Symmetry: D2
Subunit: 157 residues, 4 copies
């Protein structure tokens, strides 16, 4: 297998991703990703896209390479460019969730992050300070963002 | 491109199919297909498999070929072998529905079928008389059957 | 990602397979598989299909299931049904090769096989004695056979 | 069907493409694309990648959208950004060939191009003057470029 994706999207480990270049706040970035859907052929919407979730060191490496190869002239000595992913930090730092409802089973935070709770949002920080690992930021920041299409698999049980 | 399907399944036009050799009546054959599903990577079940629906002359020819190449020693000069698909003929012959909820936009019936309603069921009749086109049959008949995995596609607004 | 295969073929671990029902001798079965191929889009033939090779316990298990689920009424308490794969046993039992030129890195022989050398041929023996593991047979025997399409991968170096 | 491509590549019409951001002359860009190839699982080399060829108005539209959505801050009111594709204009303007040896069955030239031959090279000119349609240029100019993996398909005759 290679992952199969639609035009302009790119696949890694069974999921399809796309970096978007318009700058949106967190809630508007998530809603932008929700415009992509998965429908049954008889016409029922089953699922939406979401800001990307990340579940392994390899996935983190892939998304970092996606950002850095896509934005090479924007890479700074700082955190920038920061690109939203689907991470929400709630009332305490243990309250981490992904917008797609998947488990937080991978920790990609830059040392000292998250540090802007309660209710902050995660971003891949692809600048040289952070090398793609995540920063938390306030949700009103307007950033580029990565969407994932609905992640689904057949159950052959 | 080509259609991606799990091992033992086979693809045509974005859908995955498998011919099962146990003989079941219509409702039980549909129940057997429903054992296959589609789930989000989150773990939420999203959709269920079904007896195959058929929407074009190309799809009809593909399934006819699947049946005849899988059951070459059973091909008779009549209707047999008959293999269930997801077609339900109700109270009158115009009351045709697929178990997957898809439209009845393709007519694959042998001339003179359906003729065994009410509440008869569709089968690919792969014998030389019918050449794969459909017979309706009594629903208590136990036949081999074709399942499809949940048919889904991305909606890219 | 699943494996992508043409209609009527089925995929496992990046390779596409198909069980054929016509009974052929070994050389004719291999020739039948060589009728399928891989070409460039501008029309240069690059590779040919072959009788299946098998490189792991999981691939062995898959092909056994392919046979047993396709030929359920033919399963005996002995060796039958026997289905050709691309294995050639030469002048001694250690001279094992696959028709596709791939390495013999997996040993799927039934205990006591090969024992019909020299120049015998391997077959999945799906009857209950052998449980899909391989028997060697004489090449003049006419059996069902499994083909693989050309196995290819991108080289991203 | 969707197109299956390696990570960081993206598919259209059964072909896999990637925009590279380093600026190379035509020969060096073509050589960079030739680093990517196709091999048999056995390890035999089968094919070599190339700068992209273009065979329809839809393919032209897709590649233009890939460039424009990838380089939005670079789009000028002129021809820039120009991005190499595999088009060679030879001794006369009618002598057009693709580096991958495919047919020149589609004409994407901006009105008045080609005009800098002999032995000029084609580029998608994604600036607003030209809207993605092609300019010919001196082959020593250093531009971004689009690669395409070897285009192959199964032959099931
Ligand atoms: O969202 C990215 C980032 O925003 C805030 O930090 C900005 C700040 O970071 C760096 O300053 C230092 C250098 O060691 O890093 C930490 C930041 O936490 C500071 O204590 C320290 O001075 C850069 O050098 C500065 O240019 C930049 O202004 C926020 O504090 C971070 O948590 C993170 O969210
Ligand atoms: O489910 C199979 C088939 O069963 C019944 O027809 C069986 C009948 O079919 C053929 O007879 C003719 C053609 O000579 O076909 C129509 C079928 O209705 C008959 O009126 C006509 O005599 C075979 O030639 C016969 O041997 C066989 O007994 C049922 O009536 C069909 O609708 C269909 O469901
Ligand atoms: O290709 C299948 C198989 O063919 C030969 O064995 C077939 C043979 O097996 C059984 O005979 C016995 C029963 O005890 O099993 C061994 C198998 O080696 C024989 O020595 C013994 O007589 C069946 O009872 C027979 O009807 C059948 O003819 C071949 O010998 C095997 O290596 C294997 O290739
Ligand atoms: O490779 C890009 C482009 O380079 C040269 O044209 C650049 C030139 O284009 C436009 O000039 C006009 C406007 O009508 O277009 C033709 C292009 O040949 C010129 O004769 C004419 O002045 C822009 O307005 C200019 O700013 C820009 O300098 C080359 O001539 C083109 O063939 C094409 O290769
Ligand atoms: Ca922070
Ligand atoms: Ca009938
Ligand atoms: Ca033997
Ligand atoms: Ca020019």
């Amino acid at each position: 297998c290679l992952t199969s994706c639609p035009p302009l999207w790119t696949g890694f480990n069974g999921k399809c991703f796309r970096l978007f270049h318009n700058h949106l706040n967190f809630d508007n970035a998530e809603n932008a990703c929700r415009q992509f859907g998965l429908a049954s052929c008889s016409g029922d919407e089953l699922a939406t896209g979401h800001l990307a979730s990340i579940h392994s060191a390899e996935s983190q490496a892939f998304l970092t390479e996606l950002v850095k190869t896509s934005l090479p002239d924007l890479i700074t000595g700082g955190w920038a460019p920061q690109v939203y992913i689907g991470m929400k930090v709630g009332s305490t730092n243990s309250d981490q969730t992904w917008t797609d409802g998947s488990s937080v089973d991978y920790d990609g935070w830059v040392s000292g992050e998250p540090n802007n709770g309660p209710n902050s949002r995660g971003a891949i920080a692809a600048g040289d300070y952070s090398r793609g690992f995540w920063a938390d930021v306030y949700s009103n920041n307007n950033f580029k963002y990565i969407c994932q299409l609905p992640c689904v698999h057949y159950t052959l049980e």
